[PDB]
Design a binder for this molecule. Structure first.
Ligand SMILES: COc1ccccc1N1CCN(CC#N)CC1
Ligand SMILES: [Zn+2]
Ligand SMILES: [Zn+2]
Ligand SMILES: [Zn+2]
Length: 459
């Protein structure tokens, strides 16, 4: 039950306008053969160019929408479009490049995939809405064979050079001319009615059709993400560490404790309404307050409506005390809220482009997140950076410039000189805070929140 059997049937109806007369009865084995590749009855870690939905989902970071359009098949020029927004024209002799032979076009394809993918994935998965020219163009830029390692490192080989006769990963591929052992999935096999645009546009108003190859490539990946991450959701699937995942997650826990601890001290709310993850734990276990939890899974599609979360009749009175929405995305937060909200527009290795302005945030698990909307925050203000500690001034166990900051809220700074302990802790917390913000989290708070109110929590 692991890999896609090459003896699985492939539905050819999508193929029959580029490839008239194609047999209705078709396996992966016969299709790969028709595409001009030979798998040589090879048991060497590459059983099929094509993969299961499940396998594609585990390799979402590798997804590159790919589409080819007839420009006038060997007679005529082809437009190659990638979900990176690139269009290359290959002659057989939004970025839009003039007509060039395959021997140069293939170099550009390797450079482009290597730069997109080297910090994302060990592979490429070409996401297709297959009509035929895309599959019959692969022979011109793809080589297959046994699984190999990079010539300069231990990573699996993703590229081949005809010049040097060697194999490279995405990091070591400069001057390489062939994509090696790519994977691919035809979204049209999943059983849809009507064309790509009609199916995409059911779910997404953000990706237009300019009637160019890259636009279909983008719509194809978008539809695929919608199907595997919006309508369907699987939070069991783990994803490898590729960047600052652990630091960001640690940072998110340190900021959450800091901000909620401070709001309770500053405004002394008698009740806190903790709305979101049903696994959620008290972030300030020592606080006096009545802590009431409300279960909401991460909304992958549309932001929750505050009307459905709160009304239908709890403490019932959510207007009493404060509401904590820690990555619980709602259309409009009430005035008495503390909020962490992921900004889908952030550029990072963890954040993949998503469906209808939303983004696919992949950090241990994959969370499709609805488009960031500034109007959600009209009743709140941005939470300013600050560090608060009531811990004793007391070193123990670090090289130093003395800290001066208006935003180091400690007994020692009240006293006019920040102690070494609170200086070290301030600097660690500011680093954590910067990490979290740079990762794309944004923090919002009730308008009355004032750090001036924390100074009297020591006297
Ligand atoms: C830095 O973490 C703490 C330090 C002191 C007390 C509590 C916590 N937390 C943070 C929030 N966390 C929720 C989650 N995950 C519960 C435990
Ligand atoms: Zn390498
Ligand atoms: Zn879309
Ligand atoms: Zn101190």
């Amino acid at each position: 039950p692991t890999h896609l059997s090459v003896d699985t049937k492939f539905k050819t109806e999508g193929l029959c306008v580029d490839i008239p007369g194609i047999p209705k009865d078709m396996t992966y084995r016969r299709l790969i053969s028709m595409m001009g590749f030979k798998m040589n009855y090879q048991v060497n870690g590459y059983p099929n160019m094509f993969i299961t939905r499940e396998e594609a989902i585990r390799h979402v970071r590798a997804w590159i929408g790919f589409d080819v359009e007839g420009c006038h098949g060997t007679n005529l020029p082809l437009q190659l479009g990638f979900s990176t927004g690139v269009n290359l024209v290959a002659v057989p002799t939004p970025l839009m490049y003039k007509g060039l032979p395959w021997n140069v076009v293939r170099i550009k394809i390797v450079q482009m995939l290597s730069d997109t993918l080297k910090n994302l994935s060990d592979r490429v998965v070409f996401v297709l809405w297959a009509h035929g020219f895309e599959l019959t163009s692969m022979k011109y830029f793809v080589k297959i064979g046994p699984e190999r390692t990079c010539c300069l490192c231990d990573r699996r080989a993703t590229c081949f050079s005809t010049a040097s006769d060697t194999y490279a990963c995405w990091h070591h591929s400069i001057g390489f001319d062939y994509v090696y052992n790519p994977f691919m999935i035809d979204v049209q096999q999943w059983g849809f009615t009507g064309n790509l645009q009609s199916n995409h546009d059911l779910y997404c108003q953000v990706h237009g059709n300019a009637h160019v190859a890259s636009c279909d490539a983008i719509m194809t990946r978008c539809l695929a993400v919608h199907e595997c991450f919006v309508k369907r959701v699987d939070w069991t699937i783990e994803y490898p560490i590729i960047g600052d995942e652990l630091k960001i997650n640690a940072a998110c826990r340190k900021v959450q404790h800091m901000v909620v601890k401070a709001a309770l001290l500053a405004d002394k709310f008698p009740v806190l309404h903790d709305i979101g993850n049903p696994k959620a734990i008290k972030c300030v276990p020592q606080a006096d307050v009545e802590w009431k939890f409300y279960d909401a899974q991460p909304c992958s599609d549309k932001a929750y409506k505050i009307e459905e979360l709160f009304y239908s009749y709890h403490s019932d009175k959510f207007t009493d005390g404060v509401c904590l929405f820690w990555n619980c995305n709602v259309d409009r937060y009430p005035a008495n809220s503390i909020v962490c909200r992921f900004d889908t527009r952030v550029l990072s290795n963890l954040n993949l482009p998503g469906c209808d302005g939303g983004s696919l945030y992949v950090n241990k698990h994959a969370f499709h997140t609805p488009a960031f909307d500034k109007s959600a925050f009209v009743n709140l203000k941005q939470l300013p950076f600050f560090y608060y500690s009531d811990s004793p001034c007391e070193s123990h166990g670090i090289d130093y410039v003395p800290l001066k900051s208006a935003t180091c809220i400690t007994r020692c700074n009240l006293g006019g000189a920040v102690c070494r302990h609170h200086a070290n802790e301030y600097r660690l917390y500011l680093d954590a805070y910067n990490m979290m913000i740079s990762a794309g989290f944004s923090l919002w708070v009730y308008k009355q929140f004032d750090t001036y109110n924390l100074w009297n929590t020591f006297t």
